[PDB]
Amino acid sequence: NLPVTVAGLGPMGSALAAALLDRGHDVTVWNRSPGKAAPLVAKGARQADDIVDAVSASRLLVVCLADDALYSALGPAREALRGRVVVNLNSGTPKEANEALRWAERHGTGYLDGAIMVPPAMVGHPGSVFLYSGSAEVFEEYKETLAGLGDPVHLGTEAGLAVLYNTALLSMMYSSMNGFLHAAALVGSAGVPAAEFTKLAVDWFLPAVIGQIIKAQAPTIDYPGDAGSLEMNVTTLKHIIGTSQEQGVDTEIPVRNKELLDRAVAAGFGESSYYSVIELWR
Amino acid sequence: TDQNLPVTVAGLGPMGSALAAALLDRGHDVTVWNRSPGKAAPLVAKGARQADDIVDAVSASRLLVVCLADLYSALGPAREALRGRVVVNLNSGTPKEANEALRWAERHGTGYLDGAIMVPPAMVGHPGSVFLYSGSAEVFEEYKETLAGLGDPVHLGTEAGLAVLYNTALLSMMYSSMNGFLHAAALVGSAGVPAAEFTKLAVDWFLPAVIGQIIKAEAPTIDDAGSLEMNVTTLKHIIGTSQEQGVDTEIPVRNKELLDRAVAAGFGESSYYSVIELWR
Numbered sequence: 001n002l003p004v005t006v007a008g009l010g011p012m013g014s015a016l017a018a019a020l021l022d023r024g025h026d027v028t029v030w031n032r033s034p035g036k037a038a039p040l041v042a043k044g045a046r047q048a049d050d051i052v053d054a055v056s057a058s059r060l061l062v063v064c065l066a067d068d069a070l071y072s073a074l075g076p077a078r079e080a081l082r083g084r085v086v087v088n089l090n091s092g093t094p095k096e097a098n099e100a101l102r103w104a105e106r107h108g109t110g111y112l113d114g115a116i117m118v119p120p121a122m123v124g125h126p127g128s129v130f131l132y133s134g135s136a137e138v139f140e141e142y143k144e145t146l147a148g149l150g151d152p153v154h155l156g157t158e159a160g161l162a163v164l165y166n167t168a169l170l171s172m173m174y175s176s177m178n179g180f181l182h183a184a185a186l187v188g189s190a191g192v193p194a195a196e197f198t199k200l201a202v203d204w205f206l207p208a209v210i211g212q213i214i215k216a217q218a219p220t221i222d223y224p225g226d227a228g229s230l231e232m233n234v235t236t237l238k239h240i241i242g243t244s245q246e247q248g249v250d251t252e253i254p255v256r257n258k259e260l261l262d263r264a265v266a267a268g269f270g271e272s273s274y275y276s277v278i279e280l281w282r
Numbered sequence: 283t284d285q286n287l288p289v290t291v292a293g294l295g296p297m298g299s300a301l302a303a304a305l306l307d308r309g310h311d312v313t314v315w316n317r318s319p320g321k322a323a324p325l326v327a328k329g330a331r332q333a334d335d336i337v338d339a340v341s342a343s344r345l346l347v348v349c350l351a352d353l354y355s356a357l358g359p360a361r362e363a364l365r366g367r368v369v370v371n372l373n374s375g376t377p378k379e380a381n382e383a384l385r386w387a388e389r390h391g392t393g394y395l396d397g398a399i400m401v402p403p404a405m406v407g408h409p410g411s412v413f414l415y416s417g418s419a420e421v422f423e424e425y426k427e428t429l430a431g432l433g434d435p436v437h438l439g440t441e442a443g444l445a446v447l448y449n450t451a452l453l454s455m456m457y458s459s460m461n462g463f464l465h466a467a468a469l470v471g472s473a474g475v476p477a478a479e480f481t482k483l484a485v486d487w488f489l490p491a492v493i494g495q496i497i498k499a500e501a502p503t504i505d506d507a508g509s510l511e512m513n514v515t516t517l518k519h520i521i522g523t524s525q526e527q528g529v530d531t532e533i534p535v536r537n538k539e540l541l542d543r544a545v546a547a548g549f550g551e552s553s554y555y556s557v558i559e560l561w562r
């Protein structure tokens with residue numbers, strides 16, 4: 001029971017449909033190219049002839065398209081959307097989430113915007129987390145079904161929040177990964193084995209030092225417990241740059257990180273907190 | 283093995299003081315020394331003996347814990363008193379400097395460990411404190427129990443430069459991660475999202491469950507982030523969202539530029555981890 005329709009059968013859409021099939025939903029799939037449905041049909045999905053069919057098969061509609069492609073893909077369903085719910089899992093920016101909400105509401109359709117926080121292969125498995133924003137009543141109604149994809153975290157009722165959080169978190173992820181790669185290059189230049197360093201960095205340093213220092217620096221969280229003044233950190237960075245030069249490793253990462261600090265000291269004090277770096281960007 | 287081992291601490295800045303106080307708390311006979319007078323008094327209050335000069339300080343203990351700002355200049359006058367003692371140097375800047383200190387120590391007949399303090403002064407001698415060490419394994423095993431009073435002691439290997447190398451590495455990751463976090467916080471903050479709650483989500487969940495897992499997934503020798511090209515698209519959305527929110531795009535622009543360089547060097551369609559080959 002609990003019928004669900006998935007629109008969009010790229011790598012992620014297919015993972016979504018397959019996970020719902022694995023939990024035993026009646027899953028109807030739809031895709032622009034008809035080739036991509038066959039493996040899901042093999043797994044017990046019904047392929048919809050057309051979008052009206054797809055949409056009418058289920059009260060819940062899970063959308064995972066390539067971007068725009070929402071309006072063009074589901075538009076022809078017209079009045080069949082009325083009284084249904086769209087869970088849009090692809091949005092690029094908050095403005096696009098907001099446009100999709102307007103579109104949905106214009107058709108009498110409930111709307112949730114979601115951000116998938118794991119790769120396709122993790123969808124449906126323990127550890128999977130999806131962020132949602134939109135109507136709380138819609139969320140509470142479909143919570144149990146959404147839980148088959150990933151632990152569902154409701155951020156608030158405004159449409160654009162999930163994509164905002166997602167873009168924010170991903171921005172941190174890229175910077176952290178790049179810093180990690182500089183670190184691994186640095187120890188690798190002396191022939192340190194990467195696996196063991198990586199475990200030290202990730203199982204210990206990341207949560208015990210990086211996480212605690214972020215919470216220490218955050219002015220509204222109260223580890224005793226600080227990154228120290230900007231000046232002290234500029235000196236630390238100079239040693240990291242020195243170390244990179246003597247090891248033959250590119251100094252771009254730590255040079256940039258240092259330059260940023262120099263701008264903050266200039267705007268503020270050698271004594272100002274690390275967190276005040278943020279005021280350069282807002 | 284002497285539970286009350288005499289120890290000398292040279293350098294009484296915020297960190298050196300924390301070191302000395304932690305050893306005093308664990309019942310060592312601690313002699314302290316600093317260049318500038320005036321920093322020793324609180325430690326003397328706690329039971330430390332103040333050394334007049336560095337020969338005095340050095341000749342009081344077989345174990346010498348050094349925590350200077352910079353070593354050669356401070357301990358130079360004690361050249362001959364150094365013979366048969368052990369230096370634990372907790373403040374080298376680079377691996378080369380650690381190696382120079384080793385050569386200098388060994389020349390004078392003194393054992394040498396280099397250490398990196400991984401917590402702030404207020405955490406020294408408290409739960410969670412960790413110190414990284416490198417140098418002679420016999421020196422390490424001899425003083426391990428004493429060093430444990432400062433922080434959980436992790437021996438990385440016998441080569442002098444390793445502790446500073448690991449420390450600089452780890453700290454390089456920390457700065458990048460913090461800067462990314464600050465961009466994230468600015469971004470949610472621009473919509474009026476409260477910072478505390480976002481910070482706890484980012485740190486208590488995202489950091490270990492996502493950032494740490496993906497690093498381990500990308501690391502070729504541990505058993506992902508998708509191709510480089512997929513990630514450039516994701517970064518373009520982050521830039522777009524940053525522009526719509528009125529938040530400076532520097533951080534995600536620089537991250538994106540790095541990926542563009544990687545795809546240009548022929549690492550497009552390769553794994554994210556291959557970005558590393560741009561730097562070595």
Ligand SMILES: NC(=O)c1ccc[n+]([C@@H]2O[C@H](COP(=O)([O-])OP(=O)(O)OC[C@H]3O[C@@H](n4cnc5c(N)ncnc54)[C@H](OP(=O)(O)O)[C@@H]3O)[C@@H](O)[C@H]2O)c1
Pocket residue numbers: 227228292293294295296297298299316317318319321349350351352355356372373398399400401402403
């Ligand atoms: N505090 C932290 O957050 C932290 C965390 C981890 C690691 N560490 C490391 O621990 C080291 C020691 O730090 P600290 O907190 O004690 O402050 P610091 O400013 O790095 O060092 C101050 C100490 O170094 C001495 N010093 C400076 N120049 C000297 C010279 N030419 N000859 C002899 N002594 C000299 C100072 O003596 P005077 O007082 O006479 O000038 C003072 O005792 C740091 O450099 C840092 O790399 C610090």
Ligand SMILES: [Ca+2]
Pocket residue numbers: 215216217218219220221222
């Ligand atoms: Ca705080």
Ligand SMILES: [Ca+2]
Pocket residue numbers: 497498499500501502503504505
């Ligand atoms: Ca791996």
